[PDB]
């Protein structure tokens, strides 16, 4: 029979209290957050966003980043993601969230292949949907350092957006988290500053993901922020480079220091969207030194 | 003591066309002119406050096709900077939001302590109860320019009693100033000279009265405000008695002098 | 009638399960926490170490610094001290707990001042015993940055050592809080990184304590950190000074910079004792730049 | 609705060496400049009121060798002239 059609709907959203509790072996935290806001985009092929479902990831967990940095080993009992459209009815294209379980393997490159993935559902912009993905009973490592994903990571969100107009609204919707950890374990407090050097270390939290490239001038090291807000990074140079840290595609960098041998730079980078970071120019491949991101 | 409810409006929320969310602060304390327009001149008599009963509503005014999103949320440190990321927001204690085309509320909880009403130099810890973070994102190029109200639903306790604070806040350039914060004075070395420049904290009808003990390079002129008219005459020994209207805070006017910190004095108004 | 007199006294400590729970207003956390190991005096005047009682601080909590990151006030409901003796039954002295209910006030002088304060209580170094300190219920602020201390802070513990022979243990015993905090209301979570200028400015767990003194060469700014720990300071000079960072009692001090206008140093302390720290000189009173104290 | 009390100073009496008293009088409304220096603020926010309770305290200043005197009177009539001789000053209900 008749089925009515909306100018737009409403959702009422309200932070909730998570529910805190302590068992045998550690402790049991509920909670809900938000992972980001997803964008329009006309084009018909798909425009992924990721984010690593593991605690102590700066980009997908806020909150639950400071209880588990006391903790060791997690398990997700429940966890379950939504969808809150803020945008009109007269909205074209789709939405798609899915749960891939290897944290690695890179985004498909076609829709079809996005469909596959089990448990993938979509639905129009303007309407709200959840996709609550299956757990397990197996033990991972709160990540601590540079190791490989498939031993730590529980899975990997994937938010894809196509189909949209041109005359349509800026930004479509954004994805909550609904999660319960049972933490395990425990352990002095750890630090939540990434400190290491560009061969290839880190230790803490993953708030940066460096990656080469080789130019004309110099291989150039991109420092992509994974979360989204205030940074801060200290660099170490032990050989003079081609150039000092340059804004990339970030917004509001500055920075207090000089390039040259032995000296030290420190650049407050902020970001607006997840992805974006600041570049620097060397003439050598694997350059010594260090360099220290921190939320601040 | 003197109970007095009532209900006022703190600002109207406006679009963002930008990517970043914006934040716009309201320090809860009933001598902010920002955030109260009447409970003012009453808190002025008092020198003590309680809020019973306090709660802020969302009365929109944008077309329902509307996009985008608006929040609001009470943050009981009043010196915390507004957050950096929407995640941070949204994980505040009580953060409501909601469409721009539909009205929402938010209750917030109160205690039963009373602080000292606020005089500018005080630690907000200590004389303020909190404030108010309203965040706009999210909205397209073909969203209304006026996004909705927010308005402040209270039932305050003011308390003791003392000698009326002046009305309108004289000041003087680069010195004391005595009396509420409807403005604040800045300055900023360049190609002419010193520019000082105000700042109005408030919204609507203001009256800035000044006097220059030495010829200024210019006389007052429009920044940014809505409206302006001047009716004095700059010159060594002279007044310039001008009125700005206030849309949007931070909107004021400016002046060229050339000399740091010049001899002169200030009054300022809501008229 | 007869009381016997052990050679020594062992007490077994076992590390217990901090209980957490979720209340209508926020949480409450209780746990145990070791503050510091007192060490001898040869000396009949008293030698003080304190440690400021308020959630967020370094020095006295390290895991409820975590949990308390996310709350904006607390509640002590109870509090309680402890000492473990750890030296044998033929050293003399004596060891003094007090609790004072004024975080500024610094310790006194004189014996006869310190037992004075109320609930002072104090015994052998070779047998144990235990300080409760009634509380309030009067909410207070997470320290968030510089404050007067009578309104953020629950209190201060003093510990007290005098009277020791010369040939007695190095070290007589360690304290140890047993705490039940109300944490309420929430936010955000706030990075752990105090930052500021030399102006006296202060944001964040209060981790250093600058201060100045006068000196022939310029005035002498000394870093005192509170904790115990490694850490890490990151100084920014807008003018050139007259020398960088030098060891000034701390322990395995290394710095990687260079002291110049616009330069950036980066130096890893080591603080093995409470109140230990490093030391810039420079000719100007209250100099301009940063610095940002870390956990690292 | 709101409930305030307060305690003004409506002004400080003058000598009259005259034996014929010299009035001054102040017309009794919240908004009414004359009379209320701080009741005005809070009345310009209301558009009534009622006053449930009033008196008018003479607090001396003057030393004790002054002679003459001082009255004060409540006329309910705000329009109406100060009387012109003593006993009409005086037949008005209440005046001491």
């Known amino acids: 029979t008749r089925l009515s059609a909306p100018v737009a709907l409403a959702y009422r959203e309200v932070s909730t209290q998570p529910r805190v509790s302590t068992a045998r072996d550690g402790i049991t935290r509920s909670g809900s957050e938000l992972i980001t806001t997803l964008k329009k985009n ?7 966003t990721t984010a690593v479902l593991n ?3 700066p980009g997908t967990f806020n909150q639950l980043i400071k209880e588990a940095a006391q903790y060791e ?11 809150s459209p803020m945008s009109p009815s007269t909205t074209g294209g789709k939405v798609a969230l899915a749960f891939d ?3 690695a393997k890179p985004p498909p490159n076609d829709l079809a ?3 596959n993935i089990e448990g993938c559902v979509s639905s129009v912009p303007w309407t709200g949907f959840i996709l609550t993905v299956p757990t397990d009973s197996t033990d991972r490592f709160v990540a601590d350092g540079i190791s490989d994903p498939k031993l730590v990571d529980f899975g990997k969100l994937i938010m894809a957006t196509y189909g949209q107009g041109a005359n349509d609204a800026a930004q479509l919707g954004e994805v909550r988290v609904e999660y319960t950890v049972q933490l395990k374990n425990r352990t002095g407090s750890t630090s939540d500053a990434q400190i290491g ?8 939290p993953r708030l940066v993901s460096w990656s080469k490239t080789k130019g004309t001038a110099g291989w150039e090291h991109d420092c992509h922020f994974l979360g989204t807000g205030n940074f801060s990074l200290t660099l170490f140079y032990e050989k ?7 804004n990339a595609d970030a917004s509001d960098f500055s920075v207090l220091g000089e390039a040259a041998a032995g000296s030290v ?9 997840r992805g974006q970071g600041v570049k620097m120019v060397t003439t050598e491949e694997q350059p010594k030194g260090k360099w220290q991101a921190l939320r601040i």
Chains 1, 3 share one sequence.
């Open 240 to 246: 003079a480079p081609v150039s000092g840290l340059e």
């Open 42 to 48: 006309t084009d018909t092929e798909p425009k992924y």
């Open 55 to 57: 605690p102590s990831e």
């Open 73 to 83: 080993k997690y398990r997700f009992t429940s966890l379950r993601f939504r969808y």
């Open 113 to 115: 292949s996005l469909y």
């Open 265 to 273: 730079q420190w650049a407050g980078v902020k970001v607006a969207e």
């Open 197 to 204: 050097d560009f061969a290839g270390v880190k230790d803490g």
């Open 101 to 103: 379980r290897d944290a």
